[PDB]
Design a protein around this ligand. Sequence first.
Ligand code: AU
Length: 129
Amino acid sequence: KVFGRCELAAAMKRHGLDNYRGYSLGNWVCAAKFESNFNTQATNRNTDGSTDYGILQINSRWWCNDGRTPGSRNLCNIPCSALLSSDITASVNCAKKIVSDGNGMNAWVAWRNRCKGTDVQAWIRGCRL
Ligand SMILES: [Au+]
């Protein structure tokens, strides 16, 4: 499923991401935009052999089991395939663990390089939340 901007904003807010560990909703919508273009089905392979999954491109090196990432963890205790559902529950609940692990949203390279230090407020501009 490809979300609209305000659609993903509303769903993320319902799933408790608004100001989770201090990251306003706009940070999360900005991250999703530049990770997946709001597409729950987004997959991209890392050079190390790991693969990134879903709306927030959660990586199989640490967070999920794709069955082909040797010497890797499943710290969200899920199949990576569950990160590609039209229901963002699994991506959201795993992202809450990732952002809690001490590095915050810097774990999302696209957030660091494209959202960090910008008018992230702009991503929820006009939305009924
Ligand atoms: Au959730």
